[PDB]
Swiss-Prot record, chain A:
Source domain of life: Eukaryota
Full-length numbering of the shown residues: 319 to 529 of 529
Keyword vocabulary terms for this entry: DNA replication, DNA-binding, Nucleus, Phosphoprotein
Subunit structure: Component of the origin recognition complex (ORC) composed of at least ORC1, ORC2, ORC3, ORC4, ORC5 and ORC6.
Cellular component GO terms, alphabetical: DNA replication preinitiation complex; nuclear origin of replication recognition complex; nuclear pre-replicative complex; nucleoplasm; nucleus
Protein name, per record: Origin recognition complex subunit 4
Miscellaneous comment in the UniProt entry for this protein: Present with 2170 molecules/cell in log phase SD medium.
Organism annotation: Saccharomyces cerevisiae (strain ATCC 204508 / S288c)
UniProtKB/Swiss-Prot annotation, chain B:
Motif placement: Arginine finger: 194-197
Protein name per the record: DNA replication licensing factor MCM6
Modified residues (Phosphothreonine): 253
Signal peptide: none
Residue span relative to the full protein: 512 to 834 of 1017
Protein role: Acts as a component of the MCM2-7 complex (MCM complex) which is the putative replicative helicase essential for 'once per cell cycle' DNA replication initiation and elongation in eukaryotic cells. The active ATPase sites in the MCM2-7 ring are formed through the interaction surfaces of two neighboring subunits such that a critical structure of a conserved arginine finger motif is provided in trans relative to the ATP-binding site of the Walker A box of the adjacent subunit. The six ATPase active sites, however, are likely to contribute differentially to the complex helicase activity.
Oligomer status and interactors: Component of the MCM2-7 complex. The complex forms a toroidal hexameric ring with the proposed subunit order MCM2-MCM6-MCM4-MCM7-MCM3-MCM5; loaded onto DNA, forms a head-head double hexamer. Interacts with MCM10.
Length: 191, 312
């Protein structure tokens, strides 16, 4: 298995200090001699290690959200598929969200939330980077280019919160592959 | 016959076998089967407190993407209902009863055609959107008032024709987009879009769990008279049940009217919706009362019609 998993490191990374990084916890987590020999015989810790390195880039970001936070974002992409650039406002989300809700009860008991509360959920979604602002250069390269962006007063804050034209990070079609069919909104991943 | 009819009106699960036995060759689509089953029998048309007859019939129109099983219902109605005339629609005055001359007196006679051939039945028009403007305004002139008028050679004659239009339509591009409303995608004017009690929109995608069952049902149907298609009971008692429910004539109560005003407010809160959709759900209420064979209607059976209107 150790020879098997080194082959994976040859494939994607093909760089030794990446693999060299993995062994350092694997040889310090043992407490007696015989456990260490089984560890390099099993290499199951490398699975847990590659789990943790993966656990919150994009997928575990998605798995660790509640029922509403999925339902907002699922509506957020179904609006995003309609326009040509894919941009969508908060009112188009909410309207879409409401329309989506007006289908689950009629086909059957689910608390439809208000306007004044979705903003609190909408705050975490933009800082979970599932959305982006439409024209926002994220990080400047050096210091004096960033300092030239600090003095610049902006126009997007001067339009209100519910009209900052948010665009999409994770497209609608890819949501169907990650969201299991056991969830009720699986009919909404596909259009 | 009465021993089978009295046995079939004393149980409680008749309607659930009726919605899956009105079209045994079609997999899925219970709402379309519900509207097709309630569109065979109407109700409460009688006479208005003044002296004019109202539209007591159910109009059913099916829309959706290409290559579906929605024409199969079209092929079933005409093979099962005796009062059923089918037309291709694209290849169609004839629809609204055309005029032809006789040489004795050079006098006109009115041929029913698609529109007046059926009596207390279902006239089914496939491909409703490739028709012209003249036959569609003749259908609209035949639908505002339950009558058809023929004006030819100086004489004017109108007559009572009762029909339930089963209109099969398709979009302008074929694929149904959820981007906009029904009006811009159906591509027909408002008046001819009105006086329709129920619309059935069918959209398809890749959902393997029901798709494999649909493909297995399609390949299992392709054999010599399979039992897979078989319904819980045949059409032998269903024809006399349709006739027995047809001669019933039921009526509404006060609790149903008090729930109906709130249901009309709930349907208008979604906003076009006017008096015609209210008349369509009122006519569907006595049809579901006749199908479940209950005289004085309770609002719990009208709640399923409210859910059917909410499902559309």
């Amino acid at each position: 298995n150790l020879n098997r998993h080194i082959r994976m490191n040859f494939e994607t990374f093909r760089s030794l200090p990446t693999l060299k990084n993995s062994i350092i916890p694997l040889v310090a987590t043992s407490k007696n001699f015989g456990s260490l020999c089984t560890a390099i015989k099993s290499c199951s810790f490398l699975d847990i290690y590659n789990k943790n390195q993966l656990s919150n880039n994009l997928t575990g970001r998605l798995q660790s959200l509640s029922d509403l936070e999925l339902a907002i974002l699922i509506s957020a992409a179904r609006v995003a598929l309609r326009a040509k650039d894919g941009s969508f406002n908060f009112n188009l989300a909410y309207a879409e969200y409401e329309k989506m809700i007006k289908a689950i009860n009629s086909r059957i008991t689910i608390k439809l939330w208000l306007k004044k509360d979705v903003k609190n959920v909408w705050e975490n979604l933009v800082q979970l980077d599932f959305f982006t602002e439409k024209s926002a250069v994220g990080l400047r390269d050096n210091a004096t280019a960033a300092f030239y962006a600090s003095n610049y007063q902006f126009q997007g804050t001067m339009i209100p919160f519910d009209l900052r034209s948010y665009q999409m990070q994770i497209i609608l079609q890819e949501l169907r592959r990650i969201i299991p069919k056991s969830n009720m909104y699986y009919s909404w991943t596909q259009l | 016959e009465i021993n089978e009819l009295k046995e079939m009106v004393k149980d409680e699960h008749i309607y659930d076998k009726l919605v899956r036995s009105i079209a045994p060759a079609v997999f899925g689509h219970e709402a379309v089967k519900k509207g097709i089953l309630l569109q065979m029998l109407g109700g409460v048309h009688k006479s208005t407190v003044e002296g004019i007859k109202l539209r007591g019939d159910i109009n059913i129109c099916v829309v959706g993407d290409p290559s579906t099983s929605k024409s199969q219902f079209l092929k079933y109605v005409v093979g099962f209902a005796p009062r059923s005339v089918y037309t291709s629609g694209k290849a169609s005055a004839g629809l609204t009863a055309a005029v032809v001359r006789d040489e004795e007196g050079g006098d006109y006679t009115i041929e029913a055609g698609a529109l007046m051939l059926a009596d207390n039945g279902i006239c089914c028009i496939d491909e409703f959107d490739k028709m012209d403007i003249s036959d569609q305004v003749a259908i609209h002139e035949a639908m505002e008032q339950q009558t058809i008028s023929i004006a030819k050679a100086g004489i004017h004659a109108t007559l009572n024709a009762r029909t339930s239009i089963l209109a099969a339509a398709n979009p302008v591009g074929g694929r149904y987009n959820r981007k906009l409303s029904l009006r811009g995608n159906l591509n027909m004017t408002a008046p001819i879009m009105s006086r329709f009690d129920l619309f059935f929109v069918i959209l398809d995608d890749c959902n393997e769990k029901i798709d494999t069952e649909l493909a297995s049902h399609i390949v299992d149907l392709h054999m010599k008279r399979d039992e897979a298609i078989e319904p819980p009971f045949s059409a032998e008692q269903l024809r006399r049940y349709i006739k027995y429910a047809r001669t019933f004539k039921p009526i509404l109560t006060k609790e149903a009217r008090s729930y109906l005003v709130e249901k009309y407010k709930e349907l208008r809160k979604d906003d076009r919706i006017t008096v015609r959709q209210l008349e369509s759900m009122i006519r569907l209420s006595e049809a579901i009362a006749r199908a479940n064979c209950v005289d004085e209607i309770t609002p719990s059976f009208i709640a399923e019609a409210y859910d059917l209107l909410r499902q559309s």
